[PDB]
């Protein structure tokens, strides 16, 4: 098991876990956990808007804010059952598909603090696992790294790559995940500065959900 | 101050610190500290060979070993004063130029455990700082992250980006630098398997030198 932060070239493993805590994977998990039919990650706003149709919502962000003409932004709190149940979500975030496209594997699942325990349980039986942290605009993402460390610690493996080892050690130094992220994540700060502090609290809520999204044919859906 | 591990796109900052402990920056620091006139990073083996001439040594590695036709490999221990003093070093490593090219900074220095305090003192009067860890074939490099954390700790700064904070916290978890690396660094373990244990001990030795190599328009020199 190993951890990579904002990989540049294709990464290859049997089971890949994409992590983008401050919102992308938190949004994906939330949307599916609240009834959405699927979440389609898309690179550009053009491609996003191009897929508009009934029962399909154009969602995402640019500068962390909902683009013009979009139905929803990238705040997990917007994805309530009453608004997305049985609907398909097209999701575009800054470099969202970019991290996903550099993954060569037999399966790609989405992990967040929201479904931490469920992801851990799904991975316990898996061999050759790569936790892929999206990072932020090419920079290190503390919250992604923190979740990776929490996952690694709970897998109780001794076969750990450099990234997994550092993430686990880092995780062991944390007394309060939520506070750690509020005080040291530059992206958390940006989100708070734009008025999304509630998202930080929601996204750092552990096991609110018990689902495990998997990318199947370009679409994140729920697996048994 | 922040830390980035194997950056994909050009990263900007007034002052940058390149870190490739298990060898490249340790090699650069050792070479210049022992007399080399400068160290020129080169991308391909072909390019390197074309720079051959009097006063110049072709050095580097591929799969951690010295390629055919090369004068020195990438073991800092080969860079003895009475072997490279006054000579220009042409250095090509698997991803050397790859990482350097991503650093959009006018001030770029090389750091290793070998010149740790010297690097810290140099950075004491620097506004913006980005510690750039080279990584290992695109993967996380534990030894680089550890040096980055050690540096952040000594800078005594409060303005830390995500990478710097995570590196400092990681550094705080380490009881013994050398043992941490020998046991958990995949590249360190690889080098040990290849017969370079001496490099692991040397490169993790703190402050053998007081120099601070700086990349000045394509060449690492001592200003």
Swiss-Prot record, chain A:
Annotated catalysed reactions: (2R)-O-phospho-3-sulfolactate + H2O = (2R)-3-sulfolactate + phosphate
Enzyme Commission identifier(s): 3.1.3.71
Keywords, in A-Z order: Hydrolase, Magnesium
Top-level class of the enzyme under EC nomenclature: hydrolase
Cofactor(s) the record lists: Mg(2+)
GO MF annotation list: 2-phosphosulfolactate phosphatase activity; magnesium ion binding; sulfopyruvate decarboxylase activity
Keyword Magnesium appears in the UniProt entry: yes
Magnesium among keywords: yes
HAMAP family named among the record's database cross-references: ComB (MF_00490)
Family to which this protein belongs: Belongs to the ComB family.
Protein name: Probable 2-phosphosulfolactate phosphatase
Organism in which the protein naturally occurs: Thermotoga maritima (strain ATCC 43589 / DSM 3109 / JCM 10099 / NBRC 100826 / MSB8)
Lineage, opening ranks: Bacteria, Thermotogati, Thermotogota, Thermotogae, Thermotogales
Gene that encodes it: comB
From Swiss-Prot, chain B:
Molecular-function GO terms, alphabetical: 2-phosphosulfolactate phosphatase activity; magnesium ion binding; sulfopyruvate decarboxylase activity
Key words, A-Z: Hydrolase, Magnesium
Keyword Magnesium assigned: yes
Cofactor: Mg(2+)
Protein EC: 3.1.3.71
InterPro entries per the UniProt record, alphabetical: ComB-like, ComB-like_sf
Superkingdom, natural source: Bacteria
Reactions catalysed: (2R)-O-phospho-3-sulfolactate + H2O = (2R)-3-sulfolactate + phosphate
Enzyme class name: hydrolase
Membership in a protein family: Belongs to the ComB family.
PANTHER family hit by this protein: 2-PHOSPHOSULFOLACTATE PHOSPHATASE-RELATED
NCBIfam families: PRK00886.1-6 (NF002057)
Stated name of the protein: Probable 2-phosphosulfolactate phosphatase
